[PDB]
RNA sequence: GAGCCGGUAGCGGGCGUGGAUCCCUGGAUGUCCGAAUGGGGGAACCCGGCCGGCGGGAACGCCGGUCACCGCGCUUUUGCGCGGGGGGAACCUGGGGAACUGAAACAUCUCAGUACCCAGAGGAGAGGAAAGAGAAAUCGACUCCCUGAGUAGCGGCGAGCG
RNA sequence: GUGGUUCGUGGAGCCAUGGGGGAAUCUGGGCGGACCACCGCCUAAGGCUAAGUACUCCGGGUGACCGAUAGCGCACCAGU
RNA sequence: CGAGCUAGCCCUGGCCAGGGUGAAGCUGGGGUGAGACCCAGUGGAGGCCCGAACCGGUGGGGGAUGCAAACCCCUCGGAUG
RNA sequence: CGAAUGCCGGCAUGAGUAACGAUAAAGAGGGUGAGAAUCCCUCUCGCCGUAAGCCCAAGGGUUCCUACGCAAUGGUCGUCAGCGUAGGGUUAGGCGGGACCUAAGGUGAAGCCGAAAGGCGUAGCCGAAGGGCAGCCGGUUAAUAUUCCGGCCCUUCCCGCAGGUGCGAUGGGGGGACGCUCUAGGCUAGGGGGACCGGAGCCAUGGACGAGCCCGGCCAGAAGCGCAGGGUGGGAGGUAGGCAAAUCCGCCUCCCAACAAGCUCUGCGUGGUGGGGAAGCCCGUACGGGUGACAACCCCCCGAAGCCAGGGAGCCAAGAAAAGCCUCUAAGCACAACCUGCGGGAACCCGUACCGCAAACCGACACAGGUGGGCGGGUGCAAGAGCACUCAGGCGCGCGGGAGAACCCUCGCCAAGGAACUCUGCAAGUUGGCCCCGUAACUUCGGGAGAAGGGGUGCUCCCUGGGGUGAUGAGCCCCGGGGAGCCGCAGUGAACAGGCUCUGGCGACUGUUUACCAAAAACACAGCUCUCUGCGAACUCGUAAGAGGAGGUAUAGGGAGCGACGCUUGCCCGGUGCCGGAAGGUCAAGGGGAGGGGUGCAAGCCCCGAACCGAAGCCCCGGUGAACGGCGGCCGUAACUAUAACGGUCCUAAGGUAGCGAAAUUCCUUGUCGGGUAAGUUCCGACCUGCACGAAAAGCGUAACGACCGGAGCGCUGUCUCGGCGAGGGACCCGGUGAAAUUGAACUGGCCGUGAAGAUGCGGCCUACCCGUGGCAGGACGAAAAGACCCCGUGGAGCUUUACUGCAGC
RNA sequence: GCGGAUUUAGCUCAGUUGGGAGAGCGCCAGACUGAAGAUCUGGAGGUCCUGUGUUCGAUCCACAGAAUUCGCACCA
């Protein structure tokens, strides 16, 4: 019934990431937002 | 889908009631037949063996 | 196979023998390889007829040698060309498959005119350059598309139409 | 100033009045990622030159150290030696810069130069000694409070703004 | 042809500019809101300038502030 | 903020058990110049036929606080494009 | 603070009724436990088996073993676990990723354009089970293994010396490289029969000890080597000289230009090992086997959908970028460079355990969903991963006993009739395999054909033919063949397998598409038509830059109504878009002077400024329809009766042409005739007063084709005259487990009436004991959802034109 | 039942001071012909729908009421 979750390491690491989140304008915005915002790790760490 | 499901809380009492008419009886028991004890109206136990034959174990 | 090649001779004096029947799927346009002198050669236009029997060039001078090229300049009033060269020296300039092509139909001072295969008539400048003769399209048209349609086959766009679609949807539509 | 091996109480073993635990400041280490900059890259991992000890190389041969991105001047020479950047809750200024909503509609308009996004300086930036003010021939940085005025007034002179 | 300004194109200026014209260096040149005469005012078209107001990550105090469904949502192996 | 939804487009591999039909082709035989063109043999093209993996999901049947937020059953189409 | 279908949190409801997650089944014996249907061994039996197989990977990621242990998870148990605690378990120069190669695509010093963040982007980098690349089989623990052991085969890099030679880039060359469909040659897989060899034992039973049952009779290997193809050609010179530099290779010429020699996979092999099952004396004789006979190790068979091999053939829509190999600079060897030998040395970074057509992967659960590759064992079947049964290996679905009621589910049965049921033959039956006999109207002659219509088959004996079988001589196979015969209701025995027919509508047709309703006459289309474009094109994104277009170039690319083909597409540009005209009117900014005006003592200094000139536009003149679009009215007449042959007109742009007509465009209508039927408002055929068809949004037709839709007839059958009976599933009783929405509350009758007007609880009256479970639906305006049909709020969002205003681009 | 417009000499049509009315076609006489027809000559002919009403007077102006033809008509 290929739901959508099938995670694809490969890509699910991929398409999402640090480098990537750093990469751009926006990623790395709501990536500082966070940190400092509420704490967690980030993407990719998972 | 639920086409009927009860209208009205159910009365406390009454509910009760519905379980009331249901009565719990103790099986009926008899004394053994020599393994002196008391037992299941009709039948050897870890007690006898016997009825008039010796199967059974312990 | 998905590949170009050539469409502007330059270097002449060469000897320029019409290789093969290579007969070209990207163009509509059958061409041979060419042989040159040094054994440099070239997948080139097309032109109807020179015979598999390696036979031409063009250049500097001249040979109105059906096929062959050389500018509008040195070019015979009465000629069929392709090889459309309009400006100075941009490879070809027209007529691909194009069958008909273009007719030195008169010409006059750094001006030279074309009777514009493609249906009109005007000039292009001097020593500007041309190689006249055929195509080689056969016809190129028709052909069968019977039960399937060779368009999707054509790899080509089965970008289908619409037109008419229930929408808002696209650019003049 | 005399107890301590942290929140774990426990075990097993220990340090100290020949100023221990700990309070302070000023130290060396400071793995790998993250501006990352030596190179690559799904960070935290995998790749390169010299010095480096010489290392087992038991009758056989290393890590460690180290080291070099790029925009910046310019002593240009062959360019050597400087500054940058990456942050930051909210504050500042400049770049860019909106609908709802009010006008009981809604095109002006208001919401506002508001929200947001951006670049950037700071610890505060803003700004800041006059082609000003105003007119009593009078005043003299720039800013910020109160006051001036909700006046002078802007305006489908309508909401409101001021 | 736009901006700021209280100015919503207006009797409507000052400064700032987009695009074309393209001055004068002290009897120069803007200015006082159309403009004109006289007066009054300033001297542009470069730069620096601590302090007087803002702000809260952090430290302190204090509260007719809170008491665990109230306080920051989180008083403690919570932005987990 | 998202094409590991999905529809698309690019690149690059994998895949279609059986079986049927039988054109262009060429081989030879056919009264005429040659030839048309016939016939026969060979031949093995088709988004071609029958049918499974594969792909699909009308038609009836079940399910309806379901195995399940679409499924199970009978049935049905494509099946070298 | 009842009180906001309130938020938070407890807590009761139905309710001990509903459910246990696929009707692929269980039963017995013993074992262990505190206690076991639910754990362990064991013997009956059922289910897979093309999978319920084992494997590669993806994903998850310690889940695995081993000793412990069960509180919750495990929809019952539970001494069992993929539960808990703890210990322990995955090693590679040659497996794989990298330490190499590149297209897409991303990055990307330089370069290009932005308001800033940015864009784009060379080359170089990144970027794959696409390229590339040096071994395999036995063994061996609780666990890992192509990595541990061992046997056997290698690889690169280094030092040396030996023999060797213009070595020496990567720049050059060739070079690695390719579609699809098909098919010759030859070879292990794999499978098959051997009574042929080895062995452990049988027969029981009527019988057979005998070509009898039964187990197997390989797997791996340096090279040497004959089955075997696999990829090339040789030398000289010229080299107007290229491939930017010269020998390469490319191009011309004269000579060997073969079944020649050259260089990369299969057999033999075999070195030599291993294994090898049945053992098997210690030893558990049993959670059986870990560990010793000894194995036999032979022949003929059949043969691949990818193995050689980059085949070979045919075809069009005509099949990727960087190692290795030769050619060479810079260069440096050139008694020290490359190639080649042998000997010593050296060889890393991350990866495995188990699951893994799945309770360990996605679905929030051990959810009959899905999820990419590898032969897929055999017997029967014309062939075949289809079918029925099984091999190896897997499983018994995680709740079990027990009755057998309605009534639902799934499934089998019928006599007689045999759609009439019904909207509808929906469904379900008929039919269903291969061979022969036969084959209709129509035809785009291919095909409608499987059409339709028959008859066939089972095993035995008898004689005859043939293709692989090294001649051919146990050995295999396609095949008849004809003859005689046997027995059953039955002889594709069961399992997998079309009902046809006639006829009409539309659309051609195979398609595609509305994920969880609708595959359709809808879009797609092969095809046709007007058509815009000359390239730095026309249009589409873009703030510039740019990419797109197209490395395309008018047989081309873009707009587009129709959508094979056949026949044919007619009448009107007066409005309209548009194509063209551009002389004339008009009109923005602009240019340009009369004038007026304020202040000015005066020069001067500021506006207003208009005759005249001045852009697209629009007006007007034309063209223009496979461009929007439009294509009349009633009065009269032969018509013994009716439009009409003709005629009177009034308005427009002309005022339906050819085919067709009650069609799915005809409400009056079941229009009237016809046929079909016992009757037919559906059909199908004609008429045609066509409410309101018409050629291009085609029109009339059209074979084939359609899960399309309607209209007929033979076949068949419980659809239907009602059916009735039966089989396996819940329901019901048992024990274990033990939700859920709606709900003020409640010990809640019928009546006739009544109230807001369709009343259990108001009135008068009549039955009426207390409780419960299996049931049947009627009422409790039952549940579910603060109507989606409605109207209302100077509510919202999509789209439309000659609506308003504007912005874009032209 | 609602709307728009129309009812004139036999037929199709015209007029907004309203002031006092034909256009073409039909019909009888005159020709032209041997004849008829097409064709020149003359003519004859109207409640401008029924009834009202405002009006000096209006069929051309108004109000009902006949027939005309046209539009209309949905929501579930």
Same mark, same amino acid.
């Given at each position: 019934?290929?739901?959508?979750?099938?995670?694809?390491?490969?890509?699910?690491?991929?398409? @999402?990431?640090?480098?990537?989140?750093?990469?751009?304008?926006?990623?790395?915005?709501?990536?500082?937002?966070?940190?400092?915002?509420?704490? @967690?790790?980030?993407?990719?760490?998972? | 889908?639920?086409?009927?499901?009860?209208?009205?809380?159910?009365?406390?009492?009454?509910?009760?009631?519905?379980?009331?008419?249901?009565?719990?009886?103790?099986? #009926?028991?008899?004394?053994?037949?020599?393994?002196?004890?008391?037992?299941?109206?009709?039948?050897?136990?870890? #007690?006898?063996?016997?009825?008039?034959?010796?199967?059974?174990?312990? | 196979?998905?590949?170009?090649?050539?469409?502007?001779?330059?270097?002449?004096?060469?000897?320029? $023998?019409?290789?093969?029947? /290579?007969?070209?799927?990207?163009?509509?346009?059958?061409?041979?390889?060419?042989? !040159?002198?040094?054994? /440099?050669? $070239?997948? &080139?236009?097309? %032109?109807?007829?020179?015979?598999?029997? =390696? /036979? &031409? =060039?063009?250049?500097?001078?001249?040979? &109105? +040698?059906? *096929?062959?090229?050389?500018?509008?300049?040195?070019? %015979?009033?009465?000629?069929?060309?392709?090889?459309?060269?309009?400006?100075? *020296?941009?490879?070809?300039?027209?007529? $691909?498959?194009?069958?008909?092509?273009?007719?030195?139909?008169?010409?006059?001072?750094? !001006?030279? &005119?074309?009777?514009?295969?493609?249906?009109?008539?005007?000039?292009?400048?001097?020593?500007?350059?041309?190689?006249?003769? /055929?195509?080689?399209?056969?016809?190129?048209?028709?052909?069968?598309?019977?039960?399937?349609?060779? +368009?999707?086959?054509?790899?080509?766009?089965?970008?289908?139409?619409?037109?008419? =679609?229930?929408?808002?949807?696209? %650019?003049?539509?």
């Amino acid at each position: 019934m290929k739901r959508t979750y099938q995670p694809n390491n490969r890509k699910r690491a991929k398409t @999402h990431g640090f480098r990537a989140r750093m990469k751009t304008k926006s990623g790395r915005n709501i990536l500082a937002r966070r940190r400092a915002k509420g704490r @967690h790790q980030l993407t990719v760490s998972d | 889908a639920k086409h009927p499901v009860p209208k009205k809380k159910t009365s406390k009492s009454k509910r009760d009631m519905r379980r009331s008419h249901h009565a719990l009886t103790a099986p #009926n028991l008899t004394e053994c037949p020599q393994c002196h004890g008391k037992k299941l109206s009709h039948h050897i136990c870890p #007690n006898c063996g016997y009825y008039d034959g010796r199967q059974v174990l312990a | 196979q998905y590949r170009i090649i050539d469409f502007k001779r330059d270097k002449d004096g060469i000897p320029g $023998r019409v290789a093969t029947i /290579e007969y070209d799927p990207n163009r509509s346009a059958n061409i041979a390889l060419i042989n !040159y002198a040094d054994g /440099e050669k $070239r997948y &080139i236009i097309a %032109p109807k007829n020179l015979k598999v029997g =390696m /036979e &031409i =060039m063009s250049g500097p001078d001249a040979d &109105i +040698k059906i *096929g062959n090229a050389l500018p509008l300049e040195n070019i %015979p009033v009465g000629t069929l060309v392709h090889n459309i060269e309009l400006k100075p *020296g941009r490879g070809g300039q027209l007529v $691909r498959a194009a069958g008909t092509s273009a007719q030195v139909l008169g010409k006059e001072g750094k !001006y030279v &005119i074309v009777r514009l295969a493609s249906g009109e008539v005007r000039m292009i400048l001097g020593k500007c350059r041309a190689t006249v003769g /055929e195509v080689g399209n056969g016809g190129r048209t028709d052909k069968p598309f019977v039960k399937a349609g060779n +368009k999707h086959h054509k790899m080509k766009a089965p970008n289908v139409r619409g037109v008419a =679609m229930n929408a808002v949807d696209h %650019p003049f539509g």
